[PDB]
């Protein structure tokens with residue numbers, strides 16, 4: 114374990130150097146051709162773009178400054194970019210460039226053509242336990258890394274887990290990620306994945322990411338989430354009750370791990386005890402997992418996504434194509450000075 118301790122100490126040193134001196138202004142919009150919209154929301158979208166001189170493909174996240182302000186996301190967007198430019202781990206998407214202009218903020222990431230885990234899960238129905246375990250092990254290692262840097266992730270769900278050309282996970286969307294040493298208070302995350310202490314408006318901590326891992330493992334292995342209901346208020350009532358029903362096809366070891374991750378009392382939840390992540394890594398459900406081989410990407414993946422090359426968009430769906438407009442006047446300059 115000294116080897117793991119020394120790995121995490123170096124990881125934190127390298128993170129802090131970039132965190133204290135963030136990169137800024139490393140590309141500009143007219144260096145890229147726009148290809149296709151890959152998803153869209155209330156203040157932002159992600160496009161496929163191509164760099165004009167190198168020919169490389171990238172995923173460009175575009176945030177409208179005025180809409181970020183109106184929806185009270187200023188601090189969250191500044192967190193997202195400052196964290197992404199400072200992290201480095203095999204299962205995190207890489208930020209390659211960032212910049213801003215009179216109207217928008219831009220984060221240019223590597224493009225992962227294999228698509229969302231969500232699409233693959235919904236197409237096949239559910240994953241076998243070994244398939245769900247391969248992905249879960251990558252999330253355990255990624256959360257061990259992030260939490261040792263004092264980062265909470267706060268947006269785990271199948272749509273944020275991309276499948277790469279080797280069949281491994283790349284986590285994207287750091288819009289709710291935050292550097293936290295103790296407690297934090299903001300209501301954020303998708304309803305089915307929220308821990309009880311978020312729903313109850315408490316000061317909460319990194320144990321909310323371990324709760325969300327329990328929801329993800331359940332949904333991968335069942336094909337639906339554990340607290341499912343028609344509207345959010347009914348979902349929240351089931352979460353806080355914490356009453357969970359498991360399919361009979363679940364192994365006994367899977368049920369035991371999920372009862373310990375989906376523990377309503379945060380002071381009793383796996384990942385948040387004296388032994389930290391090691392209660393999860395040493396659980397019987399993970400007995401066949403070679404943690405070093407997963408980190409080194411030496412395990413054969415269960416599934417390789419079908420795609421034709423680094424520009425193929427067939428694993429993403431279709432959205433109305435809107436302009437990328439840039440005002441002749443600067444908007445919200447003061448709010449986004451540090452970006």
Ligand SMILES: O[C@H]1CN[C@H](c2nc(-c3cnccn3)no2)C1
Pocket residue numbers: 151152153154158159172206222223224225226272275285429
């Ligand atoms: O609307 C949200 C959900 N789906 C969108 C999306 N994100 C990406 C992607 C691809 N490669 C690297 C990073 N992000 N593709 O689609 C974003």
